[PDB]
Design a protein around this ligand. Sequence first.
Ligand code: HEM
Length: 399
Amino acid sequence: APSFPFSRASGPEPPAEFAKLRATNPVSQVKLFDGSLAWLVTKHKDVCFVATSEKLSKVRTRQGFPELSASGKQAAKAKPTFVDMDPPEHMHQRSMVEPTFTPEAVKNLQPYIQRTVDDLLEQMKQKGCANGPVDLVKEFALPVPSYIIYTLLGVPFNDLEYLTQQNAIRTNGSSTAREASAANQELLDYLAILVEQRLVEPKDDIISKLCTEQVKPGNIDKSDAVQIAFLLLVAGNATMVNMIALGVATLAQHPDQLAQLKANPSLAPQFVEELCRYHTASALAIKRTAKEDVMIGDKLVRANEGIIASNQSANRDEEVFENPDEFNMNRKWPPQDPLGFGFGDHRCIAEHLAKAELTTVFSTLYQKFPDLKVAVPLGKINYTPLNRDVGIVDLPVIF
Ligand code: HEM
């Protein structure tokens, strides 16, 4: 059994193993970092089954849960939030924060999303590139999702920049373990302080809703409110940064489609749909353990055996997406959903938010900077290490 996670085939490519497994062995066994064995599911239809089967569990204290690192086995000891829960607990807690993320709520946030993007682009413009390239990640791709989720949680304007850098340090590949843990505690310590303040004087933000509607009536306590706020922060931010950077790199790699996007900014939503299928920057979240024996394809997964369903491979499934390895924002979409945001009850709570952030970004970026250009050769882009989810660490640009 091959060791898993597989490495990406190259900087922007998925692992080469998925295409071969989809063709020859779509439900196979892989070996995890501790020598344990989990099932790997690669085909779109089977990934949807894994994501919705009520015979499967996300509870990480169950036997056989497929932790992918030693830190994850550590994290499995802490008290879970809704990301690691089964029904009925899952939606009991998830419903406490879902109202901010509904399509209607995200619709009403569009002026604020646009303002945030415009303000950051104008800061980047004033900073300029007169003395050499600037890092699009630091100047733009990082602060856009960071400022938005922090503002939704309840962080005041004056605290955004410091917390944005601390959260970035938390996952930066160049941080020592001590640096990352320190930044992590800085975030937890801050959210505790913010929860205490909103318990005394609530405002119009997610933490205040948790404090008034759940903490004070005793449905959860204030440490739960911290952990739920921390989840909303860390679950999606690094992925949002990578999606923005990957979108810019993808357009540089496909100049004909960038030309179409410059000539018609209303193509941003279709660009974003294809980006989220083609670059599956969160590909390891659909994990389960079997509560009871369950048949998947031609395999029997035994009770207490672990399962990883690759939505990245599902999104390149040739049976669903014609010519799946070509990036084409003009493609005709089949009836089947692309799975960039997962599937089933646990489907990304922030899917509409994320698509609105990405659509705002790519309908505005080249109107502000029509000559935006990646300043290094595209083959030299500093991607995330191949053993991790696809992404970009830094992206020098001029404009
Ligand atoms: C393009 C950006 C994003 C992508 C591609 C993405 C992708 C995903 C994926 C693949 C999952 C697993 C869903 C499943 O279990 O089937 C997920 C879950 C989740 N995402 Fe995102 N996400 C993004 C942005 C965000 C943002 C911005 C937030 C918070 C503001 C967020 C919060 C969450 C949470 C809390 C969950 C767990 C939901 C649950 O288990 O009920 N994500 N996301």
